[PDB]
């Protein structure tokens, strides 16, 4: 399918022409356009001025005005003589080296985007049609994944939340554990004392940094309010009626005030 | 639910109040949901990744392909840069003054239509060389393809007679038509006497290591060149059906035309609205159109020269009762030898490998008629054609 | 680096500028165009006479050929730059491979590949007809455990058992 | 300190309550997860052949885009055929000898001398003279020139130094954009101090309910800093002056709306009178002239429907004037392109809202949303009379490219 189909004739003709460019001045015995800047001589179907750049000696940090300029005048003089009749004086091939150089480019204003081509080859005018209509068709896909991708993010979000409460067992509990413990016995006192000791571990998860865990801040917040409730219960009891082991109740206000204003002391 | 009351029967297959067996029945439901979520898990994952590559390439080609046709806005709008600028010289006098004499092909048409008359009258014997082979013409890549290019220079009178359809004068295809009597059909049929005698010369038991090489080389050169040539003319009606049927059949005419379009929309008007999609410019540019039947329409006579020699070697009697596939399958062995010898000769055309299976139509259709009724030896009817079925299979690729 | 280049222009190229510009009078006089079929009809072949059009044409061959001293190296430059329409449009045909073919068909087709064979259209029902069923397992594990325990061991602690009978009212509700 | 949670892990745990506590509620989260699993497999086979044929119903328009784009296959093979055969005519035309050192030697005489336009090396005159901090704000030499001189600092490919057979910026690339990005590192810290400074003035800008209009005219004084095409954030720094500088300066606007919007609390106590007006309605009706008018319904007076145009508008400050922080994201970083040329002229966005064709992400809408909904929570008369209120809230934002749809989904 090279007649015509625009690709197999362009690959065969125009890409057999590419190796014809790769062996035009490179295989001219031997890389005569340069002074062996590349053995394979990339590319010689174009400049490739990082690969084949040795048309004369310098080629230096500032001496490209010295010898590469003298390469321009040197091979523009030797090619001013030899190219005056190589394709020069026989310039039907130079009338064709201006025909398929400028008039084919004049047809490339008609093979542009777009501009005043016909303009009824329909390419011309949406060159970003895959964005102009298929990001709009992909905006119908945004209506699709509006359901589905949001389902994926809330999906893995919920699974990650199961990981999150899976990553918090003594903490993110212990609101009802120490809360139910509170009114129960003393709270043991250990069910307040050791419970907010081993919870003061993870209350120092909520204190070795906090930003901005309003979850964990709410956790040790309710720990604080509950601890104040057993505080005012404790001195309310030992104050008003005052009937227990009095040294024990003063030990309760003592240790409970010690931890209570110890964390308020951290506040 | 309508399942749950039925599931109340399935768990009511445990008793009525059956809390231990209700627990175990719940473990059975846990097994069912367990495997159903294993397969629904991995299946849902494969579907999710299919959506991931689906939107990932709708993304990647929405953006990247929008920047591939918009990379054709970049490089093709870069095509519009030097439209009236390039080649740093008198390109206006290169395309309108130096290319004015490109519209001055007169004396080449007089000495080449006249030399196409006289020299292809000479090439009605020299490039139509035969008698007998002497390497098939001798040398039909020289001879029969000399009649192909002599018929490609007379494709100015064969194919570009269909491009020069009332271009500027009346005797360009009339006074040169008597210069095409010994010019076109003494070159195209000279390439078809050299092509039918090339493939017929390639149907000559060797045939040969230089006769079928040269002859088949002409019958692949002008065969595949004829194929891309008439494919460039059928793609001049398909590049005109792409082009002039985007102009005449825009639809904005909107009659359309009477009666040079529908029919022939889209051809549409030769020299150059009906020709330049197979003519200049046009770096081909005639299309060629040699030779039409080098083996472009004459590779059927090679696999049908072993499948007409093969079908001809039936001798329908069958000369004992079923010896049709003896000489016919012998021409199938010569079809494998001429086939692989000709693919060793010609890659593009001229019996690459189809002579084997064409000779399997010769042996297949031949053996399906020598014992069609009980007219052959009825005790030896299926053993013969079946013995050549499995044996002539095993004598080839089977 | 200024890179001072000395081509052959403005002294060579003035012969292209002035002598190939004779086509304003020379090419309009001989009128050597429209079409190349003069002596194909074997009539005139001049016609007449393509000498002044060969003065402008040969002024493009020689006067723009001596102008092509170093410009037949340099007309000679958009052989790799007027193929900008050849580097892009086939790439647009590759984009037409990618967009007129692969974006639409990979879109709606590579979309529609993972289809039923999900399957889920069975199995998510079979998940559901397990799941809700397993729900009515565990709920009927609850209520059948409830009133046997609550009336038994919560004889004493009344108004803790009110919670239990409320949950039986829900579980059987 | 900011783990894989607090990215709406609050709003994740806002399924029912983090009110003591529960691992039972974690099981409830597993139940909602399976509910989403059947709703999303339900979306999957809903869209897998069914609305994948709905995507084939889209491929009417989209394969139609492949049909005008299939004329682009004919325009692409038409232009590629004209340039295919005409470029083959170029392959035989210029390369008559071919021999490109004898037939097309504009670049074979000049294998490096045709690429000889690399003389703008290196540094650093107009990098700090044409911009003191700037000299800009009149399309001036730091807008028009020293910006584009920093585009010359990026036109200089500072790691593509020599390729010593060419050798354009071998030692010139050692301090071209190191002095242009040293002096423009001083201009970069100048616009960073102008970002924390001018954005602290935007933190002082609290014009009219709320409105940060001083941050809008001040955002006009920041479009040149984000346009600034080198490029503009060379090391993710200009956007960090637009985002990481606005990190705390979101929370001045976010703290502003946070303390602001939650103060409109006022309600009734007991309305058996109005149920004696809708019991007095059906008494003298109908059978009479109605009675009701439509009568009260005292909730129709905008006790909470006021926020439906206010905290949906202040939510549309968390969203749609944060879509005027789509005029302040970088802005809208695009477009000026040399390096402040087009946005030297065009530095005036709307930005809100305005259409939907993009892909992006943003923030600064958490507490206004949770404030609007959690404020509207104990509302037991609504949403019976507020049916089309909360469903208009459901169907609020279709056509924008903002997260106001997710707000409308939160609504």
DSSP result, D137-198: SSS-IIIIIHHHHHHHHHHS-TTS--TTTT-SSTTGGGSHHHHHHHHHHHHHHHHHHHHHHH
Helix, strand, coil % (nearest 5) of chain A? Answer: 55, 0, 40
> CA neighbours within 13 Å on the CB side: how many for B385?
23
* Chain D residue with the nearest C-alpha to that of B243: D78
CA distance C66 to A81: 9
> Of D26, D40, D93, which has the smallest distance from its Cβ to A100's Cβ?
D93
For residue C119, cis peptide bond before it (omega within 30 degrees of 0): yes
Task: Classify the phi-psi angles of D269: left when phi > 0, otherwise alpha if psi is within -120 to 50, otherwise beta.
Answer: alpha
Backbone angles phi, psi at B392, to 5 degrees: -75, -15
Identify the CA nearest to D245 among candidates D258, D226, D269, D228: D226
Please report the number of interchain residue pairs, chain A to chain D, with beta-carbon separation below 8 angstroms: 331
Task: Classify the phi-psi angles of A40: left when phi > 0, otherwise alpha if psi is within -120 to 50, otherwise beta.
Answer: alpha
∠ CA A120-A124-A129, rounded to 5°: 130
CA distance D300 to D388: 12
CA distance B74 to A128: 11
CA distance B335 to B318: 21
> Which neighbouring-strand residues pair with A123?
A125
> Of A21, A73, A107, which has the smallest distance from its Cβ to C6's Cβ?
A73
How many Å lie between the alpha carbon of D82 and the closest alpha carbon of chain B?
8
Task: Classify the phi-psi angles of D121: left when phi > 0, otherwise alpha if psi is within -120 to 50, otherwise beta.
Answer: beta
Which of residues 19 through 48 in chain A touch C, CB cutoff 8 A?
21, 45-46
∠ CA B136-B140-B144, rounded to 5°: 125
Using alpha carbons, list the distances in angstroms from residue A181 to A236, A243, D45, D327: 19, 22, 50, 54
Chain centroid to CA D133: how far? 28
- Which residues does chain B have within 8 Å of residue D83's beta carbon, measured at their own beta carbons? 79
Q: Does C1 touch chain A (CB under 8 A)?
A: yes
* Chain B residue with the nearest C-alpha to that of C129: B3
Identify the CA nearest to B160 among candidates B29, B290, B287: B287
Q: Do B33 and C123 touch (CB under 8 A)?
A: no
CA distance D407 to D411: 6
Strands (E), chain B: none
Backbone angles phi, psi at C23, to 5 degrees: -60, -15
Using alpha carbons, list the distances in angstroms from residue B282 to A3, A13, D24, D313: 12, 12, 80, 66
Residue D342 CB: number of other CB atoms within 10 A? 14
| B contact test, residue of C5, C34, C39 with most B CBs within 10 A | C39
Dihedral sign computed on CA atoms, order D234, D237, D242, D244: positive
Q: Do D44 and B48 touch (CB under 8 A)?
A: yes
Task: Classify the phi-psi angles of D349: left when phi > 0, otherwise alpha if psi is within -120 to 50, otherwise beta.
Answer: beta
Contact predicate A213/D10, CB 8 Å: no
Burial grade of A190 (CB within 10 A; 0-12, 13-18, 19 or more): middle
Method used experimentally:
cryo-EM
Dihedral sign computed on CA atoms, order D294, D298, D302, D304: negative
Chain centroid to CA B51: how far? 39
Helices (H) and strands (E) in chain B, counts: 15, 0
∠ CA A23-A28-A30, rounded to 5°: 105
Residues 6 or more apart whose Cβ sits within 8 Å of residue A62: C1
- Which residues does chain B have within 8 Å of residue C41's beta carbon, measured at their own beta carbons? 168-172, 174-176
Contact predicate A194/A170, CB 8 Å: no
CA-based Rg of chain D, rounded to a whole angstrom?
31
How many Å lie between the alpha carbon of A195 and the closest alpha carbon of chain C?
25
Identify the CA nearest to D261 among candidates D204, D313, D322: D313
Residues 6 or more apart whose Cβ sits within 8 Å of residue A262: none
Identify the CA nearest to B92 among candidates A99, D130, D332, D374: A99
CA distance from start to end of chain C:
93
| D contact test, residue of A23, A42, A111 with most D CBs within 10 A | A111
CA distance B5 to B11: 9
Which of residues 108 through 137 in chain A touch D, CB cutoff 8 A?
108, 110-111, 121-124, 126, 129-131, 133-137
CA distance D301 to D195: 44
* Chain B residue with the nearest C-alpha to that of A97: B87
Identify the CA nearest to D28 among candidates A162, A155, C168: A162
Contact predicate C10/B139, CB 8 Å: no
CA distance D97 to C73: 11
DSSP annotation of A125 reads: B
CA distance A82 to A69: 19
CA distance B318 to B328: 11
CA distance B183 to B154: 6
How many Å lie between the alpha carbon of C85 and the closest alpha carbon of chain D?
6
Backbone angles phi, psi at A125, to 5 degrees: -130, 75
Long-range own/partner contacts, residues A18-26 (CB < 8 A, 24 or more apart): A18/A45, A20/A45, A20/D91, A20/D95, A20/D98, A21/A45, A21/A46, A21/C80, A21/D95, A21/D100, A24/D95, A24/D98, A24/D99, A24/D100, A24/D101, A24/D103, A24/D104, A24/D108, A25/D99, A25/D100, A25/D101, A25/D105, A25/D108, A26/A52
């Amino acid at each position: 399918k090279e007649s015509r189909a625009y690709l197999n004739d362009e690959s065969l003709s125009y890409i057999r022409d590419p190796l014809n460019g790769q062996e035009m001045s490179k295989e001219l015995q031997h890389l005569p356009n340069d002074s062996m800047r590349l053995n394979y001589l990339v590319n010689s179907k174009q400049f490739n001025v990082k690969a084949f750049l040795r048309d004369m000696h310098k080629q230096d940090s500032f001496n490209d005005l010295n010898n590469s300029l003298d390469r321009l005048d040197s091979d523009i003089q030797d090619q001013s003589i030899h190219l005056k009749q190589l394709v020069g004086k026989n310039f039907t091939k130079y009338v064709k080296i201006k025909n398929k150089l400028d008039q084919i480019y004049k047809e490339f204003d008609e093979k542009t985007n777009e501009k005043n081509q016909c303009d009824s080859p329909k390419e011309n005018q949406i060159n970003v049609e895959s964005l102009n209509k298929k990001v709009d068709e992909v905006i119908r896909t945004t209506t699709f994944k509006l359901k589905p991708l949001m389902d994926n993010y809330q999906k893995i979000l919920n699974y990650q939340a199961t990981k999150k409460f899976i990553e918090l067992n003594k903490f993110y509990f212990n609101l009802p554990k120490s809360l139910k413990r509170c009114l129960t016995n003393n709270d043991f006192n250990e069910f307040i004392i050791e419970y907010s000791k081993g919870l003061t571990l993870r209350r120092r998860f909520n204190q070795s940094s906090d930003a901005s865990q309003s979850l964990v801040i709410k956790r040790i917040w309710t720990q604080i309010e509950n601890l104040l409730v057993t505080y005012k219960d404790l001195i309310w009891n030992s104050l008003i009626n005052s009937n227990f082991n009095i040294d024990q109740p003063q030990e309760t206000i003592l240790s409970l005030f010690s931890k209570l204003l110890n964390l308020e002391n951290f506040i | 639910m309508s399942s749950d009351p039925l599931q109340q029967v399935c768990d009511l297959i445990k008793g009525d109040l059956s809390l231990e067996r209700v627990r175990d029945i719940k473990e059975q439901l846990l097994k069912e949901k367990s495997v159903v979520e294993y397969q629904l898990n991995k299946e849902s994952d494969k579907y999710y990744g299919e959506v991931e590559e689906s939107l990932k390439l709708l993304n990647l080609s929405k953006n990247s392909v929008t920047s591939i046709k918009q990379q054709i806005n970049e490089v093709n709008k870069l095509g519009n840069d030097n439209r009236f600028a390039i080649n740093r010289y008198d390109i206006l006098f290169r395309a309108t003054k130096l290319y004015e004499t490109v519209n001055t092909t007169s004396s080449i048409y007089d000495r080449i239509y006249n030399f196409v008359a006289l020299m292809e009258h000479i090439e009605r014997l020299l490039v139509a060389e035969l008698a007998e082979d002497a390497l098939e013409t001798g040398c039909p890549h020289l001879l029969e393809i000399h009649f192909l290019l002599t018929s490609a220079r007379d494709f100015q009178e064969q194919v570009v007679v269909m491009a020069k359809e009332a271009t500027e004068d009346a005797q360009r295809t009339v006074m040169k038509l008597f210069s095409r009597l010994s010019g076109i059909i003494s070159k195209f049929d000279k390439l078809l006497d050299g092509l039918t005698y090339d493939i017929v010369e390639m149907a000559r038991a060797e045939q040969i290591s230089l006769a079928i090489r040269l002859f088949k080389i002409y019958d692949l050169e002008e065969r595949e060149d004829l194929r891309i040539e008439a494919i460039r003319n059928i793609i001049k009606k398909k590049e005109i059906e792409i082009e002039k049927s985007s102009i005449k059949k825009l639809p904005n005419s909107k009659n359309t035309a009477r009666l040079q379009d529908e029919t022939p929309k889209v051809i549409e008007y030769p020299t150059n609205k009906g020709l330049y999609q197979e003519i200049m410019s046009g770096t081909i540019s005639t299309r060629t159109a040699p030779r039409g039947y080098k083996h472009f329409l004459i590779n059927g006579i090679n696999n049908s020269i072993s499948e007409m020699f093969g079908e001809m070697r039936e001798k329908y009697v069958g000369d004992q009762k079923f010896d049709v596939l003896d000489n016919m399958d012998w021409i199938f062995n010569e079809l494998i030898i001429v086939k692989e010898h000709i693919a060793n000769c010609c890659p593009p055309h001229w019996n690459i490998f189809e002579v084997y299976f064409d000779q399997y139509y010769k042996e297949l259709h031949s053996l399906i008629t020598d014992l069609v009724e009980s007219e052959p030896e009825t005790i030896i009817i299926l053993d013969i054609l079946a013995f050549d079925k499995t044996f002539q299979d095993t004598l080839k690729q089977d | 680096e200024t890179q001072q280049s000395a081509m052959n222009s403005s002294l060579d190229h003035l012969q292209n500028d002035l002598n190939r510009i004779n086509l304003q009078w020379n090419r309009i006089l001989s009128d050597n165009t429209n079409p190349l079929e003069l002596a194909l009809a074997f009539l005139d072949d001049t016609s007449v006479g393509l000498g002044h059009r060969y003065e402008e044409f040969n002024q493009l061959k020689s006067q723009i050929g001596s102008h092509l001293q170093d410009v037949v190296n340099e007309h000679s430059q958009v052989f790799n730059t007027n193929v900008a329409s050849y580097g892009k449009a086939v790439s647009s045909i590759m984009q037409a491979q990618e967009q007129t073919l692969n974006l639409k068909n990979c879109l709606k087709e590579a979309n529609e590949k993972i289809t039923t064979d999900k399957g889920s259209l069975q199995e998510l029902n079979d998940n559901n007809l397990k799941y809700t069923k397993m729900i009515d397992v565990l709920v009927n594990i609850e209520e059948l455990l409830q009133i046997p325990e609550k009336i038994e061991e919560n004889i004493r602690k009344e108004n803790f058992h009110q919670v239990q009978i409320l949950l039986e009212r829900g579980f059987i509700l | 300190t900011m783990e894989n949670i607090d990215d709406e892990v609050l709003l994740e745990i806002l399924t029912d309550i983090n009110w003591s506590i529960e691992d039972d509620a974690d099981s409830m989260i597993e139940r909602i997860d399976l509910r989403l699993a059947e709703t999303e497999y339900l979306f999957n086979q809903n869209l897998l052949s069914l609305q994948k044929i709905g995507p084939n119903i889209r491929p009417y328009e989209d394969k139609v885009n492949d049909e005008c784009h299939r004329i682009i296959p004919t325009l692409s093979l038409f232009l590629m055929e004209m340039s295919n055969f005409s470029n083959d005519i170029e392959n035989v035309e210029s390369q008559d000898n071919g021999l490109q050192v004898e037939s097309a030697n504009k670049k074979l005489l000049w294998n490096t001398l045709d690429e000889l336009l690399k003389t703008v090396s290196l540094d650093e005159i107009s990098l700090n003279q044409l911009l003191e901090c700037p000299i800009r704000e009149k399309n001036l030499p730091w807008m028009e020139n020293q910006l584009n001189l920093l585009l010359k600092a990026f036109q200089a490919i500072g790691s593509d130094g020599n390729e010593v057979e060419y050798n354009l910026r071998e030692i010139s690339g050692l301090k071209q954009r190191l002095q242009f990005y040293e002096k423009v590192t001083k201009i970069f810290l100048n616009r960073i101090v102008e970002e924390m400074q001018k954005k602290f003035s935007n933190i002082r800008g609290q014009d009219i309910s709320h409105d940060q209009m001083i941050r809008i005219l001040t955002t006009l004084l920041i479009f040149s800093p984000l346009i600034l095409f080198c490029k503009e954030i060379s090391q993710k720094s200009y956007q960090a002056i637009v985002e990481n500088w606005n990190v705390s300066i979101q929370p001045v606007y976010m703290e502003l709306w946070t303390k602001k919007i939650s103060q409109l609390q006022g309600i009734d106590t007991n309305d058996e009178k109005m149920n004696e007006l809708s019991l007095s309605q059906l008494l003298n009706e109908w059978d009479t002239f109605r009675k009701e008018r439509k009568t009260n319904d005292i909730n129709p007076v905008f006790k909470n429907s006021f926020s439906l145009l206010t905290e949906c508008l202040q939510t549309m400050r968390q969203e749609c004037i944060v879509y005027q922080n789509f005029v302040e994201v970088f802005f809208h970083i695009s477009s000026k392109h040399n390096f402040e040329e087009y946005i030297k002229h065009f530095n005036d966005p709307d930005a809100p809202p305005i259409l939907l064709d993009t892909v992006k992400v943003m923030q600064s809408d958490r507490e206004a949303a949770v404030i609007e909904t959690q404020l509207v929570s104990r509302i037991f008369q609504p949403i019976v009379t507020r049916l089309s209120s909360y469903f208009v809230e459901l169907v609020k934002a279709e056509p924008t490219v903002a997260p106001a749809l997710t707000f409308y989904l939160e609504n």
